């Protein structure tokens, strides 16, 4: 019979990237890069965002690939964001069909048609990539921004370095706790709209909302993490690197109130699980944790 710690560590391992998934991400990168280089001047590409920080939850969706545009494409830098995104969109629809391709704020999503079963298993295949037109300006990158109509600065290496620093200060448990809350945020039980938008905001908040080092127990850490996220979701959350626009403006007021309510509900659901465990009702506690997170949380 599983202890609470044993169950959380199994959950954590189920959310870790493995070698077969990595090989699949690399293969999709080759496929999309080789194609896009026939349509645009692209010097190089790279896997980035949460995928590269080991903070992307499962199943693996919306893996960012920056496609670094050559000087021959510099005309795009002085044009509206929708122009380069339109061109990337049309190219990718031509190859993958309209149903598979979706415009996003700072990327085009390509969905490979990989089946996600009800247990969140894909036979070790990535679900989709976010294709990002990008210019390397020297100090950082610039990518298209639908909200402003223009281009914004981003340095994913600052995000990576600070995720690594938080993780080292948290006894190597920070990244896993982030992936667990992102798994909860993705739970179909919440409906069509996730509690927190974008998912990246959970990680930005966690840089401040996990603190004091690792406390030693997953269940208390998760409870307090949810409670802190509820209390702070209305704060301003700038780009931590100080380069791009704030991360906290994608939710309108009603959406943020809902975010706070669902995060607080999660903190209460976690408290119930903690109370079960305190009283020796261990299979009851595991059932409470599974109802909160979803099927990847184990009962045995």
Ligand X SMILES: Nc1ncnc2c1ncn2[C@@H]1O[C@H](COP(=O)(O)OP(=O)(O)OP(=O)(O)O)[C@@H](O)[C@H]1O
Chain contacts with ligand X (rule: CB under 6 A): 49-50, 56, 62, 64, 130, 152, 154, 156, 159, 182, 198-200, 203, 239, 243-245, 247
The Cβ-side half-sphere exposure at 142, using a 13 Å CA radius, reads: 16
The span from the CA of 216 to the CA of 214, in Å, is 6
Query: What, of Mg ion, Cl ion, ligand X, none, does residue 243 touch, CB below 5 to 8 Å by kind?
Result: ligand X
Residue nearest to Mg ion (CB): 62
By beta-carbon proximity to Cl ion, the closer residue of 171 and 193 is 193
Q: Which two tokens stand for residue 44?
A: 């190089």
By beta-carbon proximity to Mg ion, the closer residue of 62 and 223 is 62
- Does residue 16 contact residue 76 with C-beta atoms inside 8 Å? no
Which secondary structure element, helix H or strand E, spans residue 96, and what is its range?
helix 81-96
> Please, what is the minimum distance in Å from the beta carbon of residue 250 to Cl ion?
9
By beta-carbon proximity to Cl ion, the closer residue of 102 and 197 is 197
> Please, what is the minimum distance in Å from the beta carbon of residue 284 to ligand X?
31
Query: What, of ligand X, Mg ion, Cl ion, none, does residue 159 touch, CB below 5 to 8 Å by kind?
Result: ligand X
Query: What, of ligand X, Cl ion, Mg ion, none, does residue 197 touch, CB below 5 to 8 Å by kind?
Result: Cl ion
Chain contacts with Cl ion (rule: CB under 5 A): 193-194, 197
By beta-carbon proximity to ligand X, the closer residue of 153 and 281 is 153
Q: Residue 144 pairs with which residues in a beta bridge?
A: 151
By beta-carbon proximity to ligand X, the closer residue of 164 and 271 is 164
Chain contacts with Mg ion (rule: CB under 5 A): 49, 62, 64, 130
- The DSSP secondary structure of 161-183, one letter per residue, reads HHHHHHHHTTTT-HHHHHHHHHH
Question: What 3 state SS string does 265-286 have?
Answer: HHHHHHHHHHHHHHCCCHHHHH
Query: What, of Cl ion, ligand X, Mg ion, none, does residue 193 touch, CB below 5 to 8 Å by kind?
Result: Cl ion
Query: What, of ligand X, Mg ion, Cl ion, none, does residue 186 touch, CB below 5 to 8 Å by kind?
Result: none
By beta-carbon proximity to Mg ion, the closer residue of 130 and 221 is 130
- Does residue 213 contact residue 169 with C-beta atoms inside 8 Å? yes
Label residues 238-275 b or e (16+ Cβ within 10 Å = b). Answer: ebbbebbeebbebbeeeebebbbebbbebbebbbbbbe
């Amino acid at each position: 019979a599983l202890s609470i710690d044993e169950a959380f560590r199994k959950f954590k391992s189920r959310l870790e990237l493995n070698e077969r998934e990595q090989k699949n991400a690399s293969q999709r990168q080759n496929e999309v890069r080789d194609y896009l280089q026939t349509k645009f001047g692209i010097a190089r590409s790279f896997l980035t965002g949460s995928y590269a920080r080991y903070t992307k939850t499962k199943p693996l969706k919306n893996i960012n690939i920056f496609f670094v545009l050559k000087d021959s494409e510099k005309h795009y830098h002085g044009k509206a964001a929708s122009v380069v995104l339109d061109d990337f969109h049309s190219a990718l629809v031509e190859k993958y069909g309209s149903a598979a391709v979706r415009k996003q704020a700072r990327s085009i999503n390509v969905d490979f048609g990989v089946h996600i079963d009800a247990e969140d298993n894909t036979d070790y295949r990535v679900v989709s990539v976010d294709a990002v037109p990008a210019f390397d300006t020297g100090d950082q990158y610039e990518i298209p921004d639908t909200a402003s109509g223009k281009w914004i600065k981003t340095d994913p290496e600052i995000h990576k370095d600070k995720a690594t620093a938080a993780h080292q200060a948290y006894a190597n448990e920070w990244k896993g706790l982030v992936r667990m809350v992102k798994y909860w945020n993705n739970n179909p039980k919440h409906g069509d709209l996730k509690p927190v938008k974008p998912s990246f905001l959970i990680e930005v908040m966690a840089l401040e909302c996990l603190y004091g080092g690792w406390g030693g127990s997953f269940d208390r850490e998760i409870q307090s993490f949810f409670a802190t996220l509820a209390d702070r979701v209305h704060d301003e959350w700038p780009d931590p690197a100080g380069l791009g626009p704030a991360i906290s403006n994608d939710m309108d007021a009603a959406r943020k109130q809902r975010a706070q309510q669902l995060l607080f509900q999660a903190s209460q659901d976690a408290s119930i699980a903690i109370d079960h465990a305190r009283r020796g009702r261990n299979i009851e506690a595991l059932r409470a944790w599974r109802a909160l997170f979803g099927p990847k949380f184990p009962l045995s």
